[PDB]
Amino acid sequence: RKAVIKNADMSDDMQQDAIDCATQALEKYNIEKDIAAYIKKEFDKKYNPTWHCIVGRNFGSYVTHETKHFIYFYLGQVAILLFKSG
Amino acid sequence: RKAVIKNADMSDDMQQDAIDCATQALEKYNIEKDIAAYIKKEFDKKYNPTWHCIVGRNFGSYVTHETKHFIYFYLGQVAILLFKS
Amino acid sequence: KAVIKNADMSDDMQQDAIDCATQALEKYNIEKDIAAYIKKEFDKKYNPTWHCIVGRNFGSYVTHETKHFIYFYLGQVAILLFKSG
Amino acid sequence: AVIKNADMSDDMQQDAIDCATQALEKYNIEKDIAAYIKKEFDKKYNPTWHCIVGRNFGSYVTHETKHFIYFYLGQVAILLFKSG
């Protein structure tokens, strides 16, 4: 359950909030799409739309995000991509 | 990209020239502010002052234009309002 | 072999998405580079802003503009491509 | 209210904001909001006014001196100027 931030363009509070929200997501759901949905929906509520979330063990990505609204990190063995665009 | 005329009170030649001029603008600029500047200035030279141009993806407007001097159309995802007053 | 799991997109765009992805897999080995190629191509062809995910194991929840979303496999590799902003 | 750019008298600047505040209270649609403001200024200060309301647009216009304002009301940008 170790949080490891690989790359981030985001405030420390938001970053910490992202980890907490994801920790809750993993505790509640086991399917990756459900984990991502929980995180996205929560961040749309807290910090306005529009967020997108990717959860998985094997993927590569190229996305465009608003400044100070991007985080990419692991929770244990699971990778989580969360960013705001639109 | 693809030109789509939503509303127009303008000659067929002028409409096409507006589209061509706007096509050039998008090729020249990425900023809506700069794109609008090019289109307005171009129409001021070609068809005399005074023209006004609005470029963007989200706006509403209520304007008054000279007859046969108004066009409102899209180039790809970008909306272009061009009129003379 | 192309297998479309879910799609909200025009047939021309879909085919163009598959071709573009086909080129990417032939050229690159790293998924992030594959995604970069596809994203950049669709940003140029079909206007910003596109986002692309390439991989074999992931789940996602994203928001896209209507008629600008596709999710498909090329062999054993999953590709998510969508426009938002 | 946030004034981004203005070449206009202070009394008119205040009047434009007031008129726009009224517009937002009556309408939700940008097309309707712009219509209200334009008509109002055409009645009060003679033709010809033009109004743009939205969150994403760029513009290049020519206006009569002391008859131009561009400002935000909350999350909405409003362009108002006189030409013709």
């Binding site: 799409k33 | 008054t64 | 909200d8 994203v62 209507t66 054993q76 | 649609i29």
Partner: peptide, 24 residues
């Protein structure tokens, strides 16, 4: 004569969707 014009941009409709990779 002068004419009035009342035009506005198309609304860009947003949609949300779930995606899940197949079991390997």
């Amino acid at each position: 004569f002068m004419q009035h014009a009342n035009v506005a941009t198309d609304q860009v409709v947003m949609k949300s969707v779930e995606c899940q990779t197949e079991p390997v």
